[PDB]
Amino acid sequence: KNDFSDIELAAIPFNTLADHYGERLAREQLALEHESYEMGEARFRKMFERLITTLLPKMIARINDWFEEVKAKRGKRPTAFQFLQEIKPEAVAYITIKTTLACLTSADNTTVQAVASAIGRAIEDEARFGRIRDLEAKHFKKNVYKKAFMQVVEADMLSKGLLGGEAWSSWHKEDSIHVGVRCIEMLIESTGMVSLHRQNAGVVGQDSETIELAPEYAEAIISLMFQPCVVPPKPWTGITGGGYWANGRRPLALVRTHSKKALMRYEDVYMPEVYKAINIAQNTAWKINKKVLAVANVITKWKHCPVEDIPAIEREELPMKPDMNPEALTAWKRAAAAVYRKDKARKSRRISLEFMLEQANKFANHKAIWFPYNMDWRGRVYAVSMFNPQGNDMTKGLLTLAKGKPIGKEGYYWLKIHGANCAGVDKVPFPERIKFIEENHENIMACAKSPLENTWWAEQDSPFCFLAFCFEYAGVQHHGLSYNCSLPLAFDGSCSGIQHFSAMLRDEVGGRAVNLLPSETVQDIYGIVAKKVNEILQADAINGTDNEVVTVTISEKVKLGTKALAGQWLAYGVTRSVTKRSVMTLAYGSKEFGFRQQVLEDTIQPAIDSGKGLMFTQPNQAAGYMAKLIWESVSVTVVAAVEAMNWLKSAAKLLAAEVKDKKTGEILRKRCAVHWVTPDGFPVWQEYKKPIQTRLNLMFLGQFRLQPTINTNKDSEIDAHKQESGIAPNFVHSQDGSHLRKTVVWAHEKYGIESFALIHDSFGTIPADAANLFKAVRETMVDTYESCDVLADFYDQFADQLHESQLDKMPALPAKGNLNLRDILESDFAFA
C-alpha cells in the first residue's frame, strides 16, 4: 500500500466503488466517511465571520521563529520539534487554533492535558492522511437506477491500494502531549488567544492546570466518525483495511487490541473461518423501518410518553427550599443530589436518543444500508458504526433487513413467536406463545392501524420492537401468506455463560436449568435462584437480627438487621429480574461485593427514582444483604461452573506469577500471557498490564515547569490480579464468540441464509430462514463440544509453560458430567 501514489490511493477507492455500485453512491460513501472532518472544518467557520484573520498570521510567524531558535541552539532539541516539522508550519498553526476552539466550546473546563492531547492527535492524522484526504475530497465536492448493488466485491479483485493500512498511531502519548503543549505555548505570545489558569492549588485530588479562553474572544463567539455504509463494506482480507472504503482517514483493525503489537500477533495466522464469518455478517443488508420511525419521531416529543424508558424532554428543576436549622438542612441535600444525578443520567440518555433518530432519518429512504464489523481482543463481534442493530429497543426497532424470502406458514409461525418474545411472554412454551398472540388479535391490528392513538405496544417489554412486529403482523392478514417479510427474528440463549460451561463440562445439571435439555416447561434459572432467595428471605422475617447502632465518628448511624431488611424486600417482591444480572455475572468470575454494586444499580436506585423504593431506608445496606442472599443461593445451583472458573483462575494466577528462589534472585520464569485458540481457529492472548502513570517536564513559556501526569501508553509489567479476575469471563466470551461465528458460516453455507442479526448470543434472520437458523445454532454448538475439549486444549497451551512447585498448586481438572450433547438439537428453549 505504501508503494502507491497519494493520487493513486485517493482515486482507487472511488474507482473500484464507482465500478461496482455506480459513482452516485461512490461519492456519498466517501462524503459520509470524511463528513467528520467536513463538519469539523464547518464548525470552525462560525466562529470565523460571525479577529481570526489576525490570529493565524501571528501564529505562523511564531512557529517559524521558534524553529530558527531551536536550530541555532546546541544539545537535545525539544521533543515536539521534529514531530512539528512533518507538516508545513502554516497548517500547524491552523490546526492549533481549530482544535483549541473545538475543545473550549463544547466542553466547560478544560484540562491542559486534554487540549494538548487533542492537538497532538490532530497533527499526526494531518501528517499522514492530510494530502490523501484533500485529494479524495475532490470526488464528492464536484457535482455537487441501482442494482445489482447489494453484491459484495470479490476479494481477489480488490486492488492492493485497498488491502493494507496502518491502523495504529506510531506516536507515543507522551510525544503527542509534547506537541500540543508547545503548540499552546506558541499560541500564547502571540496571541495570546487562551490563558493558562491554575486551579485548586494544594488539593491532592482537585489540583489541575486548565486552559481558559480569554474574555475578548469569549464574548465574540455524535461524533460522525463511524456511520453506516450505503454500499456493501470492503471484505476483510487481513488484519486491517476491512469495513470502510476511504483512504484518507485511518483503517480499522480486525481485532480491537490494547497495543499495535497485540494486533501484529494476528498478521500471519491464517484463520479462514474467522474472516469468513465476519465478512458474511458484515455483508448483511439492512434498511430503516419507516413505520417505526414515523412513530418514534412523534412520541419521544411528548411530555408524558407512554414508554417507560424515553427520558425528558424537560430539564426538571431542583426542589424546593424549606428554616435553616439542624436536620432541615439534611434535607433536601439528599433530594437535590438525587436530582443532579437524575438529570445527568437523563441528559446523556436523551443525547443518545436524539442521535439514533437523526441517523434513522438520514437513511430512511436508502434502498439498503450496511454496518462494518469488528472484534474485541477476544472473539466477540461488534458493529463499527454508532447506530447499530445491536443497540437498545428503539434503535433495534428502527432497523430491519432489506431482502425478503417467501415467506409464510413456517415463517409466520416464528413471526408470532418473536412477537411474544418482544412482549413479556418468553418464559412460556411455544404453543402458548401463539395462543397469546391469537388472543390479542384485536390488541394487534389496531396498534398497526393507529399507533399514535393505541399505546398498548408501549406497555410491552420491547415497545418499538413489538411495534415493528405489529406492523408486520397486519401485513400478513391483508396480503396473505405470500406477504414479503424481512423482520429479523431473534433467538437468544437463556444464560449464555452457564450454557457454555454446562456444555464444555457436559454438566447434567446444569443442562437443563439453562434449557439445554428437552423439556415441556421453560426452565428459568433466574426464577429458581429467586425462589431459593425467598425461602431465605421469609426465614429472616420471623427470626433474624435486630437493628444496631455502630456509632462511627453525631456521628452515629443505624445498621439494619436481617429482620428489617427482609421486610423491605418482601415489600418490594424479589422476582427473577432482581437476580438476572447477578446470576449471569457469577459465571464470569464475580464476587459478593460485586453483586452489591449490581443490585443497587439495577434494582434499588431506579426504585427510589420511580417512587417505589421508599421502603429502602438504608439503600446500600439493603443491596449488601441481597448480594449475600444471592451469593449463597446461587452457589448451590451452579456448582460445576464454579469449579470450571476456579480451574481457569488458578491457571491464569500461576502463569502471571513471577518466580522466586531461595534468597537468590534467580529469574527461573517470568510472568506469562495467557493464550488459547478458539474452535474456529481464532487465537486470543490475555495480556492485562499494570496501568502506570508518568510525568512530563516542560519548561512552559520560560516561566515555570509544566509537569502533567499522564497515563503511559508504553507497556510495563503484567497485572497478575486482572489476569486471574479476567480469565473466566474472557474465556467463555471468546467461546460464545466462536459459536456465533461458526453459526453464521454453517447457516450461510449449508442453508441459503444471507442476512444475520447478531448480538453476541442472540441470532436473528428473516422468518423464512428462521426455521433453519433455529436449527443451525444447535448443530454448530453440538458440533463444537463434540469435536474438541476446550479445557484440555487450553491445558495443552499453558503447560509446558508452568514451572515447578507451581504444579502442586494447580488443579484439577473438572470432572465430566452425564449430559448428552445431542439433546440440545431436541431442546426447544435453548435458542442459542
Add this chain to the structure above:
RNA sequence: GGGAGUG
C-alpha cells in the same frame, strides 16, 4: 474516577 448501553 463518572455517565450510558449490551451480554
Add this chain to the structure above:
DNA sequence: AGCCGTGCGCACTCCCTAGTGAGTCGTATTA
C-alpha cells in the same frame, strides 16, 4: 526484611476525565 496503610471490587463497547511546580541530579543529545 518485615510491617502497616491504601486500592479494588466479572467482562466488553460507546460517551464526559491522566493531582501540582520546585529543587536537584543524571543523561541523552548536538553545535
Add this chain to the structure above:
DNA sequence: TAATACGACTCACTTCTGGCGCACGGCT
C-alpha cells in the same frame, strides 16, 4: 567538552455515597 532539554525522584501545598476482606505498593 559546552550547552541544552527533559526524565526520574523527592518533597510540600449536589454527595461524602457507604459497606468487607484480600492483595500490593509504599515506607523505613
